[PDB]
Amino acid sequence: KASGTLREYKVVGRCLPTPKCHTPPLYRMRIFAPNHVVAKSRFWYFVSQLKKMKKSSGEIVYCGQVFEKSPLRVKNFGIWLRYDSRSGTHNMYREYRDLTTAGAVTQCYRDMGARHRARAHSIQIMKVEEIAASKCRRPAVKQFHDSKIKFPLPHRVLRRQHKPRFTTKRPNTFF
């Protein structure tokens, strides 16, 4: 699986009706995928691990994007996941701040790549949950729980370094 800006999908599937059980149970999963094609593929990857299902023996009855229910509100996201390292598999709990659930999961995929060199196919997201500010455990997330938060922007690096490319004045950094 690659990435981009992931979206949340509600994928509901079931086994094909057989003359053994006429109405097989319906199963639902939350899939964070770049698009619904990948989401359906990852759904079969997970239900095959949990239940004895295949894409050929079952069908997907629903696959719709789960829109964020409060994209204007800042909230802390706790993510439980398992990933395969070069020498084993590990369970991790990580925290992020974002406006959307899918944005937080996208941060996690980048963060696992940055800090643990974990590619998306090694990462297995198993629980995403909005946690209260008092339940946070990561100090990087906790330091932003300040009603009077105040910080300067210290050393503003010039980003238009080629417009102009040649100039007389040396750039300012204090703003």
Partner RNA sequence: GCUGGGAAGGCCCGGCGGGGAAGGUGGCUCGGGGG
Partner RNA sequence: UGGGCCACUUUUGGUAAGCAGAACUGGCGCUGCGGGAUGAACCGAACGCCGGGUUAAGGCGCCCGAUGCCGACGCUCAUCAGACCCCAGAAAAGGUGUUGGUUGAUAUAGACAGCAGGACGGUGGCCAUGGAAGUCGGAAUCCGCUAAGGAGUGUGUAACA
Partner RNA sequence: ACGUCGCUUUUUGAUCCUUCGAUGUCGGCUCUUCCUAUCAUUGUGAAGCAGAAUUCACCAAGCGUUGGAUUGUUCACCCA
Partner RNA sequence: GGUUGGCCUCGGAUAGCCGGUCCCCCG
Cβ neighbors of 127 (< 8 A, separation 6 or more) are: 78, 79, 80, 81
Query: If binding is defined by CB under 7 A, does position 61 make contact with RNA?
Result: no
Q: Could you tell me the smallest distance in angstroms from the CB atom of residue 174 to another protein? A: 8
Q: How far apart are CA 152 and CA 137, in angstroms?
A: 26
Q: Give the nearer residue to RNA in terms of CB position, either 68 or 130.
A: 68
Binder of residue 4, out of another protein, RNA, none (CB less than 5 to 8 A by kind): none
Q: In 10 A of CB 83, how many CB atoms?
A: 19
- Closer CB to RNA, 90 or 121, in the complex: 90
Q: What is the DSSP letter of 112?
A: H
Determine, following the binding rule CB under 8 A, whether residue 163 of this chain makes contact with another protein.
no
Q: Which stretch binds RNA (CB under 7 A): 13-21, 30-38, 44-52, 133-141?
A: 133-141
User: CA dist 54 to 16, 44, 48, 146, Å?
Assistant: 10, 7, 6, 49
Query: What's the CA gap between 155 and 166, in Å, rounded?
Result: 22
Contact status: 2 vs RNA (CB under 7 A): no
List contacts with another protein (CB under 8 A): 72-74, 96-99, 107, 139-140, 143-144, 147-155, 159, 174-175
